[model samples]
Target chain A: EELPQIEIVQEGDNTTFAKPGDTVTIHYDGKLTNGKEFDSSRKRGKPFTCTVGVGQVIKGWDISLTNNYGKGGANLPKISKGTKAILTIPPNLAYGPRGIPPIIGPNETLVFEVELLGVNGQ
Target chain B: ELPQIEIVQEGDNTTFAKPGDTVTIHYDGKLTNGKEFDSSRKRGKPFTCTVGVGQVIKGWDISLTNNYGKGGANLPKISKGTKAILTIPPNLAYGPRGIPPIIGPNETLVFEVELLGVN
Candidate 1:
């Protein structure tokens, strides 16, 4: 089956993981399995904003931010502001069967470089 | 109007609007006597907000999701770019704090809305 594999590359300043209700700010770089970058919020120099645990983003993003899909509600590693991580995600969790064109392939595994800029709200 | 919604045209998707979805629309609001209160065409900008999120007037949330294409033969459809009208009661609109002189207390409001998109 397809799933998300998360790896914490850097430590975080806050001790708590992201919550379902928090609105989070993040900067991330997405790449294909071949290591070629496709997009980067860091390059835009503006962090993206969204409510955590909401379906505001791709399914795996919410899963990465919180453990919404962590095997019957199991929690993933703690993630907070200043945290940096790499996520390797499968097709079902990425773009699905109708994959995005030019960069993302059908049933492709994707990589993301994520930085937890900050989180606010309840 | 005591809160009623009417559909003037339909949009794209077969599925209707849902909670947490962001919606864009062009609208013109008026009183029952045909006095205009607000207009997107006049302002030259469409109004954008998230549905069922309490950011807009209470009437909008209730009217948009529960109402759409009306017929007995098939399922109603409301998609991106649908046009409809919403008639709101005072309690669901400005409530006790009506917009002063422009809108009187306990007045009914009607809005003709052209849905631009849902994302």
Candidate 2:
């Protein structure tokens, strides 16, 4: 019933909220625009952290986010139970055609199913 | 310079402190009976903690004050410049038997180190 459809497989399991700089641990499943499975953190039996915006990840995510501890403490974005979109990236956001992944185009849009878990500096 | 001769040497770091368990990472070089020889956690980087207790040096006043978050920010992370080496097994540190080199007499000791979070 939404314009752009986004889906959350399950809700409410994460421990804490996350900010751009806040180190976090989470289980994630990423895919391509074509909806093809690319990676899964849970599959590894251990979660990892996604350093907010610093080119540690793609620009689409870097710009599409503002806070981490959100969703009314849901630790995720406000989307439905299944979603899809074209995360258009600007040349500045991208490597300007020559990306680091070496596969994505300057205006590439990657798909992902991200989750948040824990956050702490102590 | 002290009365007790027991040390906190377990031989090179332990698995990050478990839940309810606390660790005060510290660099220490120990010797037989009591005599520090060398260490890195002592004068290099600092130490850290989250919760619970582990092998603490006998004469030291290290203890996991039993807390999670209580304006504990005032509590400074311990051994901020010492990396603790978990020298022996859970059986050592006042556990039992001769630690082979140090301790001479085994006695498991738990040390509560503050969490610095970073080096």
In candidate 1, what fraction of native interface contacts survive?
0.00
Tell me how candidate 2 scores on lDDT: 0.37
How much TM-score does chain B earn in each model? 0.80, 0.31
User: Lowest lDDT 10-mer window, candidate 1 chain B?
Assistant: B67-76
Report the lDDT tens digits of candidate 1 across residue range B24-95: 889888988999988988998888886643447757765554421111222234467677777788987887
Off by over 4 Å in 1: A69-75, B1-119
- Which candidate number has the best TM-score? 1
The candidate that achieves the highest lDDT relative to the unseen native structure: 1
Candidate 1 lands at a TM-score of 0.47
Model 2 residue runs over 4 Å out of place are: A1-7, A13-15, A42-45, A53-55, A63-96, A100-106, B1-119
Clashes of each: 0, 41
Output DockQ, candidate 2: 0.01
Cα-based lDDT for every prediction = 0.69, 0.37
lDDT digits (tens) for residues B23-115 of candidate 2: 444445454334664444666765444332122431232222211111123332233223232232323234456455645455433232223
